């Protein structure tokens, strides 16, 4: 062990006092022993942090079969780097350059050394020292055989920044789990610390300018300086990661807390990226390095997610989004609660309502992303509508402005059609393009054509005890604006006002979709549709137009998860726009108990004038009158 072996260590870091004396005094072997004692001390004093990983390992879960298998195969130098292939024998003196298949991916993913963590967990669980001896043997083997600048092609696979970042993230908890083994010599420690340093620092000078990799790589660089703050360079590493993450959270999330892709599931992924970074720092008291705006933004992203969370823990399947596992979602919230312990709403979601307090609000607008929630409450039997009238997204968004999911008494009545599949060959693309159609969502079309953009302007948003009102306008077609208003009345039901405004002429259609098992009745005499559920939790959708309006079924589908789909009812209210005069639809969306659909009619009162943004209508429901009197626009 040389003087040189300590060059990158900050000897004046708190706790390394003995290590300093020994190096200054010239006995380096005892310096190394003293450093090893400090890390062993630090390892016992805190749990390994796995939480930055895509799938964080659990120290106290029993060893399942694949993990056992992975650890045992590694003892005979068989590794399975790629999931599309099984184990390969890399030899008794390991050959890290072996090309057992002709796929680049097999060589790249080999240098993610995924099995090292497996060995760590099995070593932790059994205590069997053979796992530790082999890992130390293997780390040294790998470091010695794959130095940076070995050759052009080696560095292409071993020192590509994605993989380097993978290793700088997996190694800290792996190290933590092996550091107490008598196989972990003080000589090795120094070999490890200098090899780690080189990687984390290389990462700091090579992270990506553009795209998906940039965020992962910066976050892991930060995780390097958090995990090993003893390096002279760890504060620079942290600042660099923080800077990249802070720059990108400003660019990628709106002031209302929603992530710019407009897909609920991608917003949730983004929370993990930005929160795990901060969480790991906070665990070792380095959170003060993050600016306050970043901490607030992240908290706001969780609240934005909460606002569009339905009672079953799902988010509406807008664009490329799908249903998810409630237990996994609760575990995410519980980890978030750890970061924001004072947040009662987050605690509430973490514990399925047992602890914390319900969020501080009912209906809420996320006005930058254009997600609007109408809710009666947060309980399992609330009525909840989440509606999208957004700005433009990219690949994971669709031309669906107006569409909504309506969840009543434990059931989702109007699930979004969803994704079904991502891009592929021509055959796969037409499967995907079908799901991107405007006409299959709950909004207005002209001649069943896709709207050319989602660029909603919010005309009014107001909440109230027994009235919430949204009004927005979408420039859906070059000569046709679509104005939609939604009134959530008496925390129970909805009046939906759709206006087609401009010069274009053709077939106006307001489309609707229902759950696969709702077995609806289509009633062309009254232009109403109603579900026929045995349990009495039912829904009516009825057109209330004065003028001649038709009711027709159309092909309807829903994909809850990837590459699976179910037929489901869909329909449309249709009416001609012959000239340049505006056409108006009045529709009612009315949940009811029991088996008999209610009789609903409507009277236009004096003062009612949709042209001046004035609504004054009297509904009659099973004989009883409900006055609705509200201005549809604000600031006019």
* DSSP secondary structure letter of residue 395: T
Helices (H), 316-457: 326-339, 344-350, 426-435
Angle at 36 between CA 34 and CA 39, to 5 degrees: 115
Q: How far is the CB of 333 from Ca ion (least distance, A)?
A: 25
**Cα radius of gyration rounded to whole Å, the chain:** 30
499 closest CA partner among 405, 632, 372: 632
Residue number with CB closer to Ca ion (554 or 633): 554
Taking CB under 5 A as the binding criterion, the range among 115-123, 410-418, 471-479, 564-572 that sits at the site for Ca ion is: 410-418
Is the CA virtual torsion 259, 261, 264, 270 positive or negative?
negative
Neighbouring CB atoms inside 10 A of 86's CB total 9
Q: For residues 12 and 21, is the Cβ–Cβ distance under 8 A?
A: no
Residue number with CB closer to Ca ion (159 or 590): 159
Taking CB under 5 A as the binding criterion, the range among 13-21, 206-214, 359-367, 584-592 that sits at the site for Ca ion is: 206-214
Contacting residues for 389 by C-beta, under 8 A, at least 6 apart: 370, 372, 401, 402, 454, 456, 458, 470, 472, 474, 484
Q: How far is the CB of 347 from Ca ion (least distance, A)?
A: 32
Q: How far is the CB of 213 from Ca ion (least distance, A)?
A: 4
Q: For residues 402 and 474, is the Cβ–Cβ distance under 8 A?
A: yes
Tell me: does residue 565 bind Ca ion (CB under 5 A): no
Residue number with CB closer to Ca ion (151 or 212): 212
Q: How far is the CB of 575 from Ca ion (least distance, A)?
A: 24
Q: Which residues, in sequence order, are bridge partners of residue 231?
A: 9
Number of helices (H), then strands (E), belonging to the chain: the values are: 16, 24
The contacts found for 218-222 with CB under 8 angstroms, 24 or more apart, are: 218/243, 218/244, 218/245, 218/248, 219/52, 219/245, 219/273, 219/276, 219/277, 220/52, 220/165, 220/166, 220/168, 220/169, 221/165, 221/168, 222/277, 222/280, 222/281
Taking CB under 5 A as the binding criterion, the range among 33-41, 195-203, 324-332, 411-419 that sits at the site for Ca ion is: 411-419
Tell me: does residue 208 bind Ca ion (CB under 5 A): yes
Q: What share of the chain is helix, strand, coil (3-state, %, to 5)?
A: 35, 20, 40
Residue number with CB closer to Ca ion (208 or 382): 208
Q: How far is the CB of 53 from Ca ion (least distance, A)?
A: 18
Residue number closest to Ca ion, CB atom? 213
Residue number with CB closer to Ca ion (21 or 160): 160
Q: How far is the CB of 513 from Ca ion (least distance, A)?
A: 10
Helices (H), 341-443: 344-350, 426-435
Q: What would the two tokens of residue 375 be?
A: 């809710």
Q: How far is the CB of 418 from Ca ion (least distance, A)?
A: 6
Binding mask 372-401 for Ca ion (x = CB under 5 A): --------------------------x---
- Which residues 218-237 are close enough to bind Ca ion by CB under 5 A? none
Taking CB under 5 A as the binding criterion, the range among 67-75, 363-371, 417-425, 492-500 that sits at the site for Ca ion is: 417-425
Q: For residues 366 and 258, is the Cβ–Cβ distance under 8 A?
A: yes
321 closest CA partner among 404, 382, 263, 379: 263
Residue number with CB closer to Ca ion (191 or 416): 416
Q: How far is the CB of 496 from Ca ion (least distance, A)?
A: 18
Q: Which residue in the set 213, 409, 457, 460 belongs to the binding site for Ca ion (CB under 5 A)?
A: 213
Taking CB under 5 A as the binding criterion, the range among 230-238, 285-293, 413-421, 583-591 that sits at the site for Ca ion is: 413-421
d(CA 274, CA 301): 10
Tell me: does residue 206 bind Ca ion (CB under 5 A): no
Count the residues of the shown chain that bind Ca ion, applying the rule CB under 5 A. 7
Residue whose pair of structure tokens reads 């929160």 in the numeric block = 275
Binding mask 248-277 for Ca ion (x = CB under 5 A): ------------------------------
Tell me: does residue 415 bind Ca ion (CB under 5 A): no
Tell me: does residue 161 bind Ca ion (CB under 5 A): yes
Per DSSP (E only), the strands in 81-126 are 88-89
Q: How far is the CB of 259 from Ca ion (least distance, A)?
A: 17
Q: Is 434 exposed, middle or buried (0-12, 13-18, 19+ CB in 10 A)?
A: middle
Q: How far is the CB of 440 from Ca ion (least distance, A)?
A: 7
Q: How far is the CB of 161 from Ca ion (least distance, A)?
A: 4
Q: Which residue in the set 416, 498, 565, 574 belongs to the binding site for Ca ion (CB under 5 A)?
A: 416
Residue number with CB closer to Ca ion (437 or 608): 437
Which backbone phi and psi does 446 adopt, to 5 degrees?
A: -110, 120
* DSSP secondary structure letter of residue 610: G
Residue number with CB closer to Ca ion (416 or 574): 416
d(CA 386, CA 238): 39
Q: What would the two tokens of residue 24 be?
A: 């200054």
The catalytic site residues sit at 266
Residue number with CB closer to Ca ion (248 or 287): 248
Classify 128 as helix, strand or coil: coil
Residue number with CB closer to Ca ion (208 or 621): 208
Residue number with CB closer to Ca ion (438 or 483): 438
- Which residues 162-201 are close enough to bind Ca ion by CB under 5 A? 162
* Residue numbers at the binding site for Ca ion (CB under 5 A): 161-162, 208, 213, 398, 416-417
């Amino acid at each position: 062990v040389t003087r040189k072996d300590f060059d990158h260590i900050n000897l004046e870091y708190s706790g390394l006092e003995k290590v300093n004396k020994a190096v200054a005094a010239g006995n380096y072997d005892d310096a190394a022993k003293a450093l090893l004692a400090y890390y062993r001390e630090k390892s016992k004093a805190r749990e390994p942090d796995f939480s930055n990983a895509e799938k964080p390992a659990d120290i106290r879960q029993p060893i399942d079969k694949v993990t056992r298998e992975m650890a045992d195969k590694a003892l005979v130098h068989q590794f399975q780097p790629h999931k599309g292939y099984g184990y390969f024998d890399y030899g008794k003196d390991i050959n890290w350059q072996m090309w057992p298949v002709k796929d680049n991916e097999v060589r790249w993913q080999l240098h993610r050394v995924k099995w090292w963590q497996a060995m760590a967990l099995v070593y932790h669980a059994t205590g069997d020292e053979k796992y530790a001896r082999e890992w130390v043997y293997q780390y040294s083997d790998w470091a010695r055989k794959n130095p940076l600048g070995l050759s052009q092609d080696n560095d292409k696979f071993v020192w590509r920044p994605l993989e380097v970042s993978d290793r700088v993230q997996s190694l800290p908890p792996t190290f933590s789990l092996f550091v107490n083994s008598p196989a972990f010599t003080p000589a090795f420690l120094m070999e490890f610390l200098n090899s780690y340093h080189q990687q984390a620092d290389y990462l700091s000078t090579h992270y990506a300018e553009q795209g998906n990799h940039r965020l992962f790589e910066a976050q892991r660089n930060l995780f390097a300086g958090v995990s090993f703050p003893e390096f002279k360079d760890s504060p620079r590493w942290r600042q660099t990661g923080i800077s990249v993450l802070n720059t990108e959270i400003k660019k990628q999330v709106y002031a209302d807390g929603m992530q710019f892709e407009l897909s609920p599931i991608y917003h949730v992924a983004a929370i993990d990226i930005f929160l795990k970074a901060y969480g790991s720092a906070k665990r070792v008291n380095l959170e003060k390095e993050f600016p306050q705006s970043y901490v607030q933004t992240v908290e706001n992203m969780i609240m934005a997610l909460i606002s569009i969370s339905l009672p079953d823990y799902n988010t509406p399947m807008f664009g490329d989004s799908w249903i998810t596992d409630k237990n996994f979602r609760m575990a995410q919230f519980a980890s978030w609660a750890r970061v924001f312990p004072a947040n009662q709403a987050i605690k509430y979601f973490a514990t399925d309502g047992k602890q914390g307090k319900a969020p501080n609000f009912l209906s809420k607008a996320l006005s930058n992303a254009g997600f609007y929630t109408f809710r009666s409450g947060w309980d399992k039997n609330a009525t909840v509508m989440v509606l999208k009238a957004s700005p433009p997204g990219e690949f994971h968004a669709q031309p669906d402005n107006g569409t909504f999911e309506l969840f009543i008494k434990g059931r989702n009545f109007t699930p979004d059609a969803g994704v079904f599949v991502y891009s592929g060959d021509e055959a796969i693309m037409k499967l995907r393009n079908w799901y991107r159609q405007t006409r299959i969502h709950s909004t207005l079309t002209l001649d069943n054509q896709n709207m050319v953009i989602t660029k909603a302007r919010q005309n009014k948003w107001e909440t109230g005890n027994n009235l919430d009102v949204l009004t927005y306008t979408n420039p859906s077609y070059p000569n046709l604006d679509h104005q939609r208003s939604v009134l959530f009345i008496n925390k129970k039901y909805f009046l939906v006002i759709d206006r087609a405004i401009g010069e274009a002429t053709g077939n106006l259609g307001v489309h609707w979709q229902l759950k696969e098992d709702s077995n609806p009745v289509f009633d062309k005499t009254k232009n109403r549709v109603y579900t026929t559920y045995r349990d009495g939790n039912n829904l009516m959708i009825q057109s209330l137009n004065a003028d001649r309006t038709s009711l027709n079924e159309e092909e309807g589908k829903v994909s809850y998860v990837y590459n699976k789909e179910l037929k489901r009812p869909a329909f449309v209210f249709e009416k001609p726009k012959k000239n340049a005069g505006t056409q108006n639809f009045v529709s009612i969306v009315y949940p009811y108990d029991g088996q008999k659909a209610p009789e609903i009619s409507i009277r236009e009162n004096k003062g009612n004038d949709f042209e001046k943004g004035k609504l004054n209508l009297t509904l009659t429901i099973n004989g009883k009158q409900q006055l609705v009197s509200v201005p549809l626009e604000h600031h006019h």
